[PDB]
Symmetry: C3
Subunit: 240 residues, 3 copies
Amino acid sequence: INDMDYPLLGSICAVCCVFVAGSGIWMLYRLDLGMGYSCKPYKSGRAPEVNSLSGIICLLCGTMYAAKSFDFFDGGGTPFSLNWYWYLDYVFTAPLLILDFAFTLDLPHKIRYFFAVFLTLWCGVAAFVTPSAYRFAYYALGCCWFTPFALSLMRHVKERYLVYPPKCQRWLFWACVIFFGFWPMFPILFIFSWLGTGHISQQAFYIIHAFLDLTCKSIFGILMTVFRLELEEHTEVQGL
Amino acid sequence: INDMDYPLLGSICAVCCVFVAGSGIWMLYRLDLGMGYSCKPYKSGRAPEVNSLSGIICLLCGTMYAAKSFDFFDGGGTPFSLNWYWYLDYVFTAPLLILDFAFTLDLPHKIRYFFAVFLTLWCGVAAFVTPSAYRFAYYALGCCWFTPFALSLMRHVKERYLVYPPKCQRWLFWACVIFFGFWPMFPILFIFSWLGTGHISQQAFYIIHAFLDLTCKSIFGILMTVFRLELEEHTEVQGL
Amino acid sequence: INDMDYPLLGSICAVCCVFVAGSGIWMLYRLDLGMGYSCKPYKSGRAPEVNSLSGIICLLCGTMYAAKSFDFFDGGGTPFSLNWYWYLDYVFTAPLLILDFAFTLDLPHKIRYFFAVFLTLWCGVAAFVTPSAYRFAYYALGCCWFTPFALSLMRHVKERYLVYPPKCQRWLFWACVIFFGFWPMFPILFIFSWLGTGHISQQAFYIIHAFLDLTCKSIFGILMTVFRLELEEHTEVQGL
Ligand SMILES: CCCCCCCC/C=C/CCCCCCCC(=O)OC[C@H](COP(=O)(O)OCCN)OC(=O)CCCCCCC/C=C/CCCCCCCC
Ligand SMILES: CCCCCCCC/C=C/CCCCCCCC(=O)OC[C@H](COP(=O)(O)OCCN)OC(=O)CCCCCCC/C=C/CCCCCCCC
Ligand SMILES: CCCCCCCC/C=C/CCCCCCCC(=O)OC[C@H](COP(=O)(O)OCCN)OC(=O)CCCCCCC/C=C/CCCCCCCC
Ligand SMILES: CCCCCCCC/C=C\CCCCCCCC(=O)OC[C@H](COP(=O)(O)OCCN)OC(=O)CCCCCCC/C=C/CCCCCCCC
Ligand SMILES: CCCCCCCC/C=C\CCCCCCCC(=O)OC[C@H](COP(=O)(O)OCCN)OC(=O)CCCCCCC/C=C/CCCCCCCC
Ligand SMILES: CCCCCCCC/C=C\CCCCCCCC(=O)OC[C@H](COP(=O)(O)OCCN)OC(=O)CCCCCCC/C=C/CCCCCCCC
Ligand SMILES: CCCCCCCC/C=C\CCCCCCCC(=O)O[C@H](COC(=O)CCCCCCC/C=C/CCCCCCCC)COP(=O)(O)OCCN
Ligand SMILES: CCCCCCCC/C=C\CCCCCCCC(=O)O[C@H](COC(=O)CCCCCCC/C=C/CCCCCCCC)COP(=O)(O)OCCN
Ligand SMILES: CCCCCCCC/C=C\CCCCCCCC(=O)O[C@H](COC(=O)CCCCCCC/C=C/CCCCCCCC)COP(=O)(O)OCCN
Ligand SMILES: CC(C)CCC[C@@H](C)[C@H]1CC[C@H]2[C@@H]3CC=C4C[C@@H](O)CC[C@]4(C)[C@H]3CC[C@]12C
Ligand SMILES: CC(C)CCC[C@@H](C)[C@H]1CC[C@H]2[C@@H]3CC=C4C[C@@H](O)CC[C@]4(C)[C@H]3CC[C@]12C
Ligand SMILES: CC(C)CCC[C@@H](C)[C@H]1CC[C@H]2[C@@H]3CC=C4C[C@@H](O)CC[C@]4(C)[C@H]3CC[C@]12C
Ligand SMILES: CC(C)CCC[C@@H](C)[C@H]1CC[C@H]2[C@@H]3CC=C4C[C@@H](O)CC[C@]4(C)[C@H]3CC[C@]12C
Ligand SMILES: *C\C=C(C)/C=C/C=C(C)/C=C/C1=C(C)CCCC1(C)C
Ligand SMILES: *C\C=C(C)/C=C/C=C(C)/C=C/C1=C(C)CCCC1(C)C
Ligand SMILES: *C\C=C(C)/C=C/C=C(C)/C=C/C1=C(C)CCCC1(C)C
């Protein structure tokens, strides 16, 4: 029912729009001046193309949040909503999150990891738009995709977590908290939302989701950016 | 008219959902233990990223079939149908089929081959949704894309079919049967369906399409997987 | 209001459909016989995959124009329109234009350049479909994406424009005219169209847009093709 407090939801989106986008602008700025903390200039003179994927998602996420605010500030139900169809944008950003994570730590099966998340969210898009007993079938189909994705990722992360120096592991550990602790929270709120159990309020739903993306995009991007700065500093200017 | 036997169509989709997805899980499992039949471990320890594209399409095709079943099992006309708009999913899998085929045999013009199929199907999506005299114009526009695509592919396949050892050529020949014998059957059923001639029944349409994807995705994926196993066995452990 | 002269608009689209597609077929034909004007055969025997991106866009643009004509020739409002939602196709071709430009001149930040244009147009798609005070917010959000994109591109182009020989610079200069002189004309007509100021007539809108794509796709593709022919001729057969 169209009775939730959109001005609030819009404001929330606008506030996190600046934070996520601003973090993206910072990490893009921090990328193109130094390999590490000593600001080592790239010998060729061009930062690796895959490195920028962390900043772009935040700007990609920040650009979407601006849209969401515009949807909320206009009273909802806009022709270009990005909120009526849920996880619709996630389809474009979440598969990119694992792509840079796989690129940052050289995790194998990158195309499998992309299509694991890509197929995971399209079930969530299908689950939302289908009010019926088969909504959870898509959820089950979606969870049939994420569960083998969350697994083997923990195995892959663990196999290389022990290779990094202790300085670099602290940021990776905090990336794993964001990664293996909060990504499983999207399916959990799907069960408890008005779609299933009914705990999460229709309005509340957006606000907690607004406050997780910061952790999943921006803060995850910051931890990835700081982790890469530590990684290159230990390997390039030190040769260790 | 909504009077076809969806439970049947759904069951068909569900049965081939397990077969296509199960074949994809097998070929992904068969990929990451051996270069060839001797199960030669990859020297770096990570199977090539382009190799997995054969398995992923089946899981990508199997995930879609589950959706189609859910559309049929719910009586049709679901908000997330994947059946109301035809060839809509093909847009995501058929361009990937030629991408791995081009990658498997090192065929040139891979981006031209991707956009040949990608533009071929978007005319089929447009042809379906347009009941008018211009449906066949999109079909003609689509066939104006596939016909120069089917050609030059036969020339490209032939130029390298004679380089492979006789053991590897048997699977490639059976890939070509699936490739140059069944892909031209999608346009043929478009003419004869209720859209054009009227031979193929609305219901029958789905069942024959359900039974070709197995050949085009799963069986094609199996033949591609077996062909790659023969190819690497002759080249890696034998050096011939 | 559905009272504009579609037969005209359709004819315009059909005439430029042949010109853009025909130019694409020429530059694809011109690509696969010679590195330069001396028709130097590629030593491996396969033109670089990124080189063909100039031809494909024209065929991608020509295929869309055929569709637009079919939409116009059928009276408008077709189920597969490509005209009802504006810049919707641009989302697929404009990000590819900058991708080959970045590839042709080895410009850095290619993924940033792709997502700059990709996010720029999705605001234009959102701006059109949203009749409200927030249409210009998407326009402002879109211009908040293009303005930092148009800039740094001029800096990047200038940094390498002085390295090319004078023969190659003439085509690049004429690419820059098409690039930095006409791309900023799409936002300008958005302001003055019936959406904003009201200068550009609903009908006129399509005809000037039809006549810019030729410059942005086809003629830009020709200038890119001629520029690459000059570039390789000076570097490959001359070694200068
Ligand atoms: C801005 C940066 C974005 C970057 C990346 C974007 C990629 C993601 C693409 C997002 C797709 C957006 C689709 C959203 C559709 C929303 C439909 C909607 O809101 O419907 C509800 C609403 C009913 O509400 P009210 O009438 O208020 O009811 C109360 C009674 N007074 O219905 C409408 O407003 C009618 C909707 C008009 C048509 C919708 C047009 C959607 C825009 C099309 C462009 C997107 C292209 C998608 C590609 C496929 C082509 C369909
Ligand atoms: C699950 C794994 C999938 C993996 C990859 C997915 C990529 C492919 C994307 C598929 C897009 C799906 C679109 C399907 C739309 C179906 C529309 C439909 O069925 O309409 C008919 C039906 C009429 O039938 P009944 O009312 O039964 O008539 C009988 C009278 N009692 O109409 C409806 O049900 C209304 C439809 C509700 C809105 C449709 C919402 C579609 C879902 C949107 C998510 C997809 C995003 C697409 C991106 C662009 C944004 C539009
Ligand atoms: C051909 C080569 C193309 C290559 C690349 C293609 C990629 C770009 C994808 C383009 C998406 C096309 C969407 C266009 C939707 C147009 C809607 C439209 O015209 O509505 C207006 C019109 C009202 O006009 P009239 O009734 O004449 O009014 C006057 C009163 N007598 O409404 C209709 O006709 C109803 C529309 C029927 C349903 C629309 C179906 C759109 C086709 C779906 C396939 C596209 C898939 C998109 C993916 C997401 C799934 C939605
Ligand atoms: C929540 C709101 C929505 C969120 C996003 C809104 C827009 C965000 C702002 C722009 C995002 C990034 C633009 C992407 C295209 C530009 C490519 C790019 O950034 O390249 C990096 C390039 C630097 O590369 P170096 O390595 O020094 O080059 C030497 C070659 N080795 O970046 C730059 O040039 C700096 C940024 C552009 C310079 C132009 C300065 C003037 C810009 C006008 C401001 C317009 C308002 C936008 C506000 C934020 C802008 C930072
Ligand atoms: C028709 C229904 C829909 C069809 C599809 C439904 C889901 C299909 C099942 C999962 C598909 C693939 C998941 C993609 C993300 C995982 C990435 C992946 O497979 O990586 C391969 C990786 C092996 O790599 P190696 O080379 O040994 O690693 C060492 C590094 N050199 O695979 C694995 O780890 C095996 C699969 C995951 C292990 C976790 C085991 C427990 C999984 C719980 C089962 C959940 C139900 C799903 C059923 C099928 C699962 C196989
Ligand atoms: C405005 C209307 C819509 C616009 C577009 C309509 C369709 C455009 C015509 C086809 C576009 C391109 C097709 C893409 C898939 C083909 C791949 C391709 O072109 O590969 C190049 C390959 C040449 O490669 P080389 O380097 O010689 O190979 C040796 C290996 N080193 O091209 C060819 O083989 C030439 C073109 C195909 C040959 C088949 C000839 C017979 C074709 C029947 C004509 C059908 C009508 C289409 C009209 C235009 C066709 C040119
Ligand atoms: C539970 C409370 C949650 C609060 C939300 C978080 C707010 C943002 C603050 C940062 C969160 C993530 C930080 C991750 C840890 C990195 C911090 C850090 O110390 O980084 C340094 C250096 O790296 C950095 O600079 C990273 C921190 C920079 C973060 C900048 C904040 C994000 C950018 C937003 C600016 C624009 C926002 C617009 C205004 C908001 C309007 C609402 C790494 O080295 P140290 O361990 O200090 O060792 C010292 C010797 N090397
Ligand atoms: C006209 C009847 C069509 C019947 C449909 C086909 C059913 C599937 C059977 C396989 C079809 C394709 C097989 C292609 C040929 C490869 C078979 C083969 O022999 O492979 C071997 C080895 O490779 C293989 O193992 C490939 C065959 C494995 C196929 C496994 C079947 C697909 C996986 C599905 C399992 C899960 C399905 C769920 C249950 C179904 C519920 C409906 C290659 O070497 P050989 O020539 O034997 O030489 C011996 C010395 N090297
Ligand atoms: C303001 C008037 C605008 C008119 C529209 C333009 C019409 C198209 C004409 C070409 C426009 C762009 C040309 C760019 C400059 C390149 C021309 C040129 O000279 O190229 C040569 C060689 O390269 C070429 O051949 C490029 C020109 C080829 C252009 C072919 C025209 C496009 C193909 C369309 C054919 C099919 C169209 C269907 C019919 C139309 C139905 C409506 C480069 O060397 P030169 O400087 O001559 O030095 C000589 C010693 N090397
Ligand atoms: C409470 C919520 C936020 C998080 C719940 C998940 C936490 C408990 C998970 C997320 C990521 C996980 C870490 C991921 C990787 C490793 C490296 C391994 O060699 C030891 C365990 C360790 C350190 C894990 C401990 C458990 C961990 C921290
Ligand atoms: C009857 C249906 C299923 C298939 C119709 C197409 C068949 C006849 C086509 C598909 C692929 C084709 C093969 C593709 C490649 C070659 C290699 C060439 O050096 C000799 C011909 C040969 C061996 C072709 C023979 C004809 C062939 C088998
Ligand atoms: C463009 C070149 C490669 C030819 C490929 C397009 C051919 C195969 C297409 C173009 C126009 C098409 C025809 C257009 C209209 C109809 C009417 C319909 O009720 C039966 C099929 C039929 C008769 C089509 C058959 C296929 C056809 C002839
Ligand atoms: C009048 C319309 C069509 C075009 C307006 C933009 C024109 C004036 C712009 C577009 C591209 C620009 C050129 C781009 C690159 C360079 C190289 C630099 O080292 C000197 C300036 C020069 C040569 C620019 C001059 C101005 C220029 C030609
Ligand atoms: C913003 C970034 C991320 C990674 C968001 C991720 C969301 C998921 C991984 C959600 C998964 C879902 C599943 C498994 C089933 C129901 C639908 C969801 C999309 C919520
Ligand atoms: C599932 C995999 C494949 C390769 C399916 C392929 C389908 C085509 C190549 C279909 C082509 C069509 C044409 C040329 C014209 C009418 C519309 C079709 C999509 C049926
Ligand atoms: C056909 C190729 C090109 C490059 C067309 C490009 C169009 C743009 C770069 C348009 C930009 C817009 C902006 C910045 C804001 C309003 C919406 C537009 C899409 C017109």
